């Protein structure tokens, strides 16, 4: 039994941008089955997660359909998931052949290569397909860990 009341009262949301329908119709219309997501973006990646926006995260990491119906919930975590010595605990893929599909999972650690012939991680033209974010606490408002 949903309530939709703990999201409108508080104002600690970074970007409360709904898509598909309005926020007022979410309390009256029934829903058959809801699906939630959980991921941490590198601050300036919230604008890329939109039905029509592109970049480096909404192409082969988390694809959003153009006819999506929901709401974006983002909030800062500069004190909950931040470390002054280093937060090397989150990575992201930046090398993959072709874009992904909406709501896909690509959990893998195989090396990246343009053609076939799977190479080894130690090579000259083959590198790791993932890279750590590197969240800090003494940076600007752009490089901050936001949970969307």
């Amino acid at each position: 039994v949903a309530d939709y009341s703990v999201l409108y009262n508080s104002t600690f949301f970074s970007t409360f941008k709904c898509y598909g329908v309005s926020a007022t119709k979410l309390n009256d219309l029934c829903f058959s089955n809801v699906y939630a997501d959980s991921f941490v973006v590198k601050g300036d990646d919230v604008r890329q997660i939109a039905p029509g926006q592109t970049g480096v995260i909404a192409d082969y990491n988390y694809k959003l359909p153009d006819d999506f119906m929901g709401c974006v919930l983002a909030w800062n975590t500069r004190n909950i998931d931040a470390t002054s010595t280093g937060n090397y605990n989150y990575k992201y893929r930046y090398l993959r052949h072709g874009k992904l599909r909406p709501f896909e999972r690509d959990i893998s650690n195989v090396p990246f290569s343009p053609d076939g012939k799977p190479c080894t991680p130690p090579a000259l033209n083959c590198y790791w397909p993932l890279n750590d974010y590197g969240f800090y606490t003494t940076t600007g408002i752009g490089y901050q860990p936001y949970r969307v």
Partner: antibody, heavy 122, light 110 residues
Framework: QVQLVQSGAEVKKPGASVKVSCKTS????????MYWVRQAPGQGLEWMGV????????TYAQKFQGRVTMTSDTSTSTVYMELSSLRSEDTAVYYC???????????????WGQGTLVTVSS | EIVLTQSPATLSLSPGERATLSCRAS??????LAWYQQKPGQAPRLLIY???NRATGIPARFSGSGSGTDFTLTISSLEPEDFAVYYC???????????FGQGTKLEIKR
């Protein structure tokens, strides 16, 4: 490779119920929209027939609302269609196709089955 | 529901030319159109989804277009194994609806 194997032919009396299955294999059958179509001889197919395998949500068309009832099985990974009140204009080949997107999204058909010839006569 | 109307409904051309398949809707719908390719006797096959992206396994000779209410399918080079009936599917947004057209036969000109 993704492939959908169906049953063979099945003749049914004009007024009984038909039970046609759609076996899927080759992929993780947990988050994928399943559809159903049937091309009539000379005419075409126009209805959604989308059923959620994971959840228990079903969707039917306007002309076929209380005549068709579908169900899914997360254990055997095979959906079942139950169309009651068989008419003389529904005797055609029934197909079941998957979706290109996942459950939250929706797209066109990408993987088709093989066909199930259903006939309603003597 | 949005109905699909096909005025030509037929296209008799020779292998090597370009196709002029059309798919027009009733109202001013979005670009959520997807064509198909169903060989007579075999199972249907997806050709172009969302009217702006190429499907998997489809060669480079197939390239669709269209925006809003003027959609068309232009084939680069016709192949003898590509002569079949093509259906376009239109999808709605809110009530998870999907509508199909009528189909256009493509017979080899002789």
């Amino acid at each position: 490779q993704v492939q959908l194997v169906q049953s063979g032919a099945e003749v049914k009396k004009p007024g009984a119920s038909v039970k046609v299955s759609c076996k899927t294999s080759g992929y993780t059958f947990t988050d994928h929209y399943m559809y159903w179509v049937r091309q009539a001889p000379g005419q075409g197919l126009e209805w959604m027939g989308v059923i959620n395998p994971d959840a228990g949500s079903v969707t039917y068309a306007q002309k076929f609302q209380g005549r068709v009832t579908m169900t899914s099985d997360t254990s055997t990974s095979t959906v079942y269609m139950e169309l009651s009140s068989l008419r003389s204009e529904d005797t055609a080949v029934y197909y079941c196709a998957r979706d290109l997107f996942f459950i939250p999204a929706a797209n066109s058909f990408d993987y088709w089955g093989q066909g199930t010839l259903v006939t309603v006569s003597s | 529901e949005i109905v699909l109307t096909q005025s030509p409904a037929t296209l008799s051309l020779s292998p090597g030319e370009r196709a002029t398949l059309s798919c027009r809707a009733s109202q001013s719908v979005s670009s959520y159109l997807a064509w198909y390719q169903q060989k007579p006797g075999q199972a249907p096959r997806l050709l172009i989804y969302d009217a702006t992206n190429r499907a998997t396994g489809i060669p480079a000779r197939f390239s669709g277009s269209g925006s809003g209410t003027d959609f068309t399918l232009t084939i680069s080079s016709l192949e003898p194994e590509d002569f079949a009936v093509y259906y376009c599917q239109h999808r709605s947004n809110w009530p998870r609806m999907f509508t199909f057209g009528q189909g256009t036969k493509l017979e080899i000109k002789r």
